[PDB]
Design an enzyme around this catalytic site. Structure first.
Site, mmCIF file in Angstrom:
data_model
loop_
_atom_site.group_PDB
_atom_site.id
_atom_site.type_symbol
_atom_site.label_atom_id
_atom_site.label_comp_id
_atom_site.label_asym_id
_atom_site.label_seq_id
_atom_site.Cartn_x
_atom_site.Cartn_y
_atom_site.Cartn_z
ATOM 1 N N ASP A 111 0.827 -1.207 0.000
ATOM 2 C CA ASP A 111 0.000 0.000 0.000
ATOM 3 C C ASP A 111 0.864 1.261 0.000
ATOM 4 O O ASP A 111 1.237 1.766 1.050
ATOM 5 C CB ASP A 111 -0.911 -0.069 1.228
ATOM 6 N N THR A 112 1.186 1.781 -1.179
ATOM 7 C CA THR A 112 2.058 2.947 -1.266
ATOM 8 C C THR A 112 1.407 4.224 -0.741
ATOM 9 O O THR A 112 2.101 5.196 -0.426
ATOM 10 C CB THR A 112 2.547 3.182 -2.700
ATOM 11 N N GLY A 113 0.082 4.233 -0.639
ATOM 12 C CA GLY A 113 -0.642 5.372 -0.079
ATOM 13 C C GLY A 113 -0.809 5.340 1.429
ATOM 14 O O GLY A 113 -1.441 6.238 1.995
HETATM 15 C C1 LIG Z 1 -9.035 5.680 -1.433
HETATM 16 C C2 LIG Z 1 -9.976 4.475 -1.381
HETATM 17 C C3 LIG Z 1 -11.227 4.782 -0.565
HETATM 18 C C4 LIG Z 1 -10.391 4.078 -2.803
HETATM 19 N N1 LIG Z 1 -9.249 3.376 -0.772
HETATM 20 C C5 LIG Z 1 -8.744 3.341 0.467
HETATM 21 O O1 LIG Z 1 -8.814 4.249 1.285
HETATM 22 C C6 LIG Z 1 -8.102 2.031 0.836
HETATM 23 C C7 LIG Z 1 -9.129 1.248 1.652
HETATM 24 C C8 LIG Z 1 -8.634 -0.145 2.018
HETATM 25 C C9 LIG Z 1 -9.629 -0.870 2.923
HETATM 26 C C10 LIG Z 1 -9.628 -0.375 4.364
HETATM 27 C C11 LIG Z 1 -8.214 -0.391 4.926
HETATM 28 C C12 LIG Z 1 -7.324 0.499 4.066
HETATM 29 C C13 LIG Z 1 -7.245 -0.025 2.630
HETATM 30 C C14 LIG Z 1 -6.293 0.860 1.833
HETATM 31 N N2 LIG Z 1 -6.838 2.201 1.566
HETATM 32 C C15 LIG Z 1 -5.917 2.952 0.790
HETATM 33 C C16 LIG Z 1 -4.892 3.614 1.368
HETATM 34 O O2 LIG Z 1 -3.750 3.653 0.672
HETATM 35 C C17 LIG Z 1 -5.234 4.865 2.128
HETATM 36 C C18 LIG Z 1 -5.251 6.021 1.129
HETATM 37 C C19 LIG Z 1 -5.387 7.371 1.792
HETATM 38 C C20 LIG Z 1 -4.252 8.151 1.985
HETATM 39 C C21 LIG Z 1 -4.377 9.395 2.597
HETATM 40 C C22 LIG Z 1 -5.625 9.854 3.002
HETATM 41 C C23 LIG Z 1 -6.757 9.076 2.802
HETATM 42 C C24 LIG Z 1 -6.636 7.832 2.188
HETATM 43 N N3 LIG Z 1 -4.318 5.138 3.223
HETATM 44 C C25 LIG Z 1 -4.688 5.243 4.507
HETATM 45 O O3 LIG Z 1 -5.825 5.126 4.912
HETATM 46 C C26 LIG Z 1 -3.566 5.493 5.476
HETATM 47 C C27 LIG Z 1 -3.699 4.846 6.839
HETATM 48 C C28 LIG Z 1 -2.355 5.043 7.496
HETATM 49 N N4 LIG Z 1 -2.305 5.880 8.531
HETATM 50 O O4 LIG Z 1 -1.374 4.466 7.064
HETATM 51 N N5 LIG Z 1 -3.243 6.889 5.543
HETATM 52 C C29 LIG Z 1 -2.435 7.930 5.365
HETATM 53 O O5 LIG Z 1 -1.358 7.563 4.917
HETATM 54 C C30 LIG Z 1 -2.708 9.372 5.651
HETATM 55 C C31 LIG Z 1 -1.715 10.298 5.367
HETATM 56 C C32 LIG Z 1 -1.948 11.639 5.632
HETATM 57 C C33 LIG Z 1 -3.160 12.034 6.167
HETATM 58 C C34 LIG Z 1 -3.378 13.383 6.426
HETATM 59 C C35 LIG Z 1 -4.585 13.800 6.966
HETATM 60 C C36 LIG Z 1 -5.561 12.850 7.235
HETATM 61 C C37 LIG Z 1 -5.337 11.500 6.977
HETATM 62 C C38 LIG Z 1 -4.128 11.076 6.436
HETATM 63 N N6 LIG Z 1 -3.888 9.768 6.181
#
Ligand SMILES: CC(C)(C)NC(=O)[C@@H]1C[C@@H]2CCCC[C@@H]2CN1C[C@@H](O)[C@H](Cc1ccccc1)NC(=O)[C@H](CC(N)=O)NC(=O)c1ccc2ccccc2n1
Lengths: 99, 99
Positions: free
Chosen positions: B25-27
């Site tokens: 998960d690069t995001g």
């Molecule tokens: C984007 C969609 C909705 C299509 N997909 C996802 O969110 C998926 C959902 C599945 C199923 C539930 C568990 C998680 C997985 C994977 N995610 C994708 C991620 O890569 C997700 C993308 C994302 C990044 C940034 C903001 C919102 C969504 N990453 C995360 O949820 C992670 C969790 C974590 N702490 O590692 N988040 C973040 O990296 C992150 C960075 C900065 C930031 C700033 C402000 C608020 C939130 C926030 N989160």
């Protein structure tokens, strides 16, 4: 390019004539952009992530240029701290993970 | 190996000597696992993504092997449906995005 992951993989995209910064996200099935205007019809939809579900606007067949590579596909627009390019467009530009 | 993005990039990991499936998960900044009762001390943490913030348990310096590539670092345990391997461990195994 080859992009490492010591920092967030943020890149510049072009969409609707405008430049934005977006995250290349292999964990995301879909592409989700921060609230914005895009041309054409949209459909209300819901999508889920780590915190739960949100309501988005679904736009179909939207051209997105990602570091000079062209994609045309579904873009979802909704409340989000970061623009996320998901697998639906990453596949179109030939993006893979390598280690 | 090279992992394409036609399907979710799910791979096998080893944690506590046991095998699990996890999303590369690069995001994701962090590595977030499905509920599991790891031994030892942990700290509460809040993490967010689409849909809002969730409470997770933070465990430090946990070995995680990803497709036979060894890493060690912080893992967060939460109520999520899928294990996600985030950049904190992806960097340790030399993972890049390529297009
Ligand atoms: C984007 C969609 C909705 C299509 N997909 C996802 O969110 C998926 C959902 C599945 C199923 C539930 C568990 C998680 C997985 C994977 N995610 C994708 C991620 O890569 C997700 C993308 C994302 C990044 C940034 C903001 C919102 C969504 N990453 C995360 O949820 C992670 C969790 C974590 N702490 O590692 N988040 C973040 O990296 C992150 C960075 C900065 C930031 C700033 C402000 C608020 C939130 C926030 N989160």
């Amino acid at each position: 390019p080859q992009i490492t992951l010591w920092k967030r993989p943020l890149v510049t995209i072009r969409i609707g004539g405008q430049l934005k910064e977006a995250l290349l996200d292999t964990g995301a099935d879909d592409t989700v952009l921060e609230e914005m205007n895009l041309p054409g019809k949209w459909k209300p939809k819901m999508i889920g992530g780590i915190g739960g579900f949100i309501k988005v606007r679904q736009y179909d067949q939207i051209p997105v240029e990602i570091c000079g590579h062209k994609a045309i596909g579904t873009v979802l627009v909704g409340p989000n701290p970061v623009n996320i390019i998901g697998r639906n467009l990453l596949t179109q530009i030939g993006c893979t993970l390598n280690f």
